[model samples]
Target: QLHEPAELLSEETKNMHRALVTLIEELEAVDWYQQRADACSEPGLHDVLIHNKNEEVEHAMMTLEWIRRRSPVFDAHMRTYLFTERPILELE
Candidate 1:
């Protein structure tokens, strides 16, 4: 699961390890593959409903929830701001 020696690390470090490996692992493919679709509307996806866009939308949520799962930082951030119908700064 780890490229580094795991026994030397704390569970906290290990927690983030899962994020980088998972986030980057998933994000690299997500970004690179998405960039490949880069603004060329000639014969590629624009706004059509098919597979990937929705999949990415959903997986992005999966990751967002994953982020919120551990850190109270995001929890408080979301709590303070989410569902606010005004300027976000006002919520802040």
Candidate 2:
């Protein structure tokens, strides 16, 4: 997963690196669970899928927040877009 030389990698870069890996994986799980939940007919199975998907989203959100906390552009842009009411493109 790491392409950069370990000696050259910043501590922050390493942390963000790990977060991105988990973030993509958890979001992927959320995607699969959402679709599988819809395709299945069992009420019991649907509830379990939903439960897992909810946790996936929560963890992914934390991961996204972690990266944003580390990046200046992410922090500023998120502030502008996340809570703003303006048309999204206009916000940019």
Candidate 3:
């Protein structure tokens, strides 16, 4: 579970919440993909993971759109952070 921000946290804190959710969704997609890849023998099942990842990204884009409407600066920061952060894998 994620730690909630204090009531008086800064704009940065709010932006972090959006980021966390996006990351969570992305991580979930990757985890599901990894598990299916490991267990399934068919190529189609592996392809489903890719489709799932795309859907998660689409959700993240929607989140970013909402964030942009509320806070332009935070939106910019999120764009930068998402682009610059190193790629993450669900399992080692």
Candidate 4:
């Protein structure tokens, strides 16, 4: 789960939260999709992949809602994940 930053944030914080959640959810979906796809035949697993892809789309929509609420100053920064600079996977 995502946590609010240490510093007090404006409404954009919620957008950050949504973006974090959406990214995590999408990664989970990708993992699950790959696993399921590996376990079953392509024909049988197509539906599952489609469903997970749909979930990713839903997550993106939620992220977009948060982005719309962000302040202009941080709008661009919050728009994309700069993983190279702050590698999340390395910490955990």
The number of the candidate with the highest lDDT is 2
Candidate 4: stretches off by over 4 Å: 1-8, 47-92
lDDT of model 4, residue 16: 69
Measured by TM-score, the strongest candidate is: 2
- Candidates arranged by lDDT, highest first: 2, 1, 3, 4
lDDT of 4 at 49: 81
Question: Model 2: per-residue lDDT, tens digit, 7-48?
Answer: 999898888889999999999999999999999999999999
The 0-to-1 C-alpha lDDT of every candidate, in the order given, reads: 0.70, 0.93, 0.69, 0.65
lDDT of 4: 0.65
Better of 1 and 3 by lDDT: 1
Q: Give the poorly placed runs of model 3, Cα more than 4 Å off.
A: 1-19, 27-41, 75-92
TM-scores for every candidate against the unseen true structure: 0.58, 0.87, 0.48, 0.44
Say what the RMSD of model 3 is.
Answer: 7.4
Better of 2 and 3 by lDDT: 2
> What's model 1's overall lDDT?
0.70
The TM-score obtained by model 2 is 0.87
Writing each residue's lDDT as its tens digit, candidate 1 over 22-86 gives: 66666556665566566646464643423464576567668778878888988888899888799
Tens-digit lDDT string for candidate 4 (1-92):
44546466666566567576776777678677767766776785677786776777677657665655654644655545444465765533
Candidate 1 runs further than 4 Å off: 1-8, 24-38, 41-50
